[PDB]
Amino acid sequence: MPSIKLQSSDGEIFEVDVEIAKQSVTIKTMLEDLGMDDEGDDDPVPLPNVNAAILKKVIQWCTHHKDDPPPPEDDENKEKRTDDIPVWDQEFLKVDQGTLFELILAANYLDIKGLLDVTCKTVANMIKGKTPEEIRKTFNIKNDFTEEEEAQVRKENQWCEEK
Question: Can you tell me the distance from the alpha carbon of 40 to that of 146, in angstroms, rounded to the nearest whole number?
Fold first, then answer.
């Protein structure tokens, strides 16, 4: 199996498995256009969007999501529609905002709405899971029956800190 060749904005080229990069939507067009996919260390095309600092996190997100643990025998699906986030994703929602912020934007121009949604859910989680504007707080964000709230329809909160 070959791999994807892409060069970050500052000139730091990255090579990694093409199956993971398949999650990146704007990469498939790039792959057919100037990718060719021959050996994987192919001619590097510069991407003026992200540098190697952020890109590694974005493409490693794709790393696990193509490799998510296959269903054993009884329950044949992975998820219905966003129900159980893997330990891979989990760590990216407890990190510094410097990386967390770009995780949304980096995903935007790559069209990985999967990545974008998970981090967006978490950023908006701290308020009320509503509109993700911090300026919303002027009118109290958006009423969402926070009077109840205790139902906690999520669980899986072991509170295992560190990484």
Answer: 51
The length of the chain in residues reads 163
Burial of residue 119 (number of CB atoms within 10 Å: 0-12, 13-18, 19+):
buried
Whose structure tokens read 């967006």?
Answer: 120
Three-state DSSP at 13 gives strand
- Strands 13-17, 45-46: pairing kind: unpaired
Rounded Cα distance, 156 and 33, in Å: 43
Looking at residue 139, which CATH number applies to its domain? 3.30.710.10
CA 30, 81, 151, 85 dihedral sign is: negative
Method in brief: NMR
Picking from 20, 96, 90, 108, the residue whose alpha carbon sits closest to that of residue 53 is 96
State in Å, rounded, how far the first CA of the chain is from the last one: 31
Which range marks the domain in which residue 32 is found?
Answer: 1-163
In whole angstroms, what is the distance from residue 156 CA to residue 6 CA?
37
Residue linked to tokens 């991407």: 47
Q: How many domains does the chain have?
A: 1
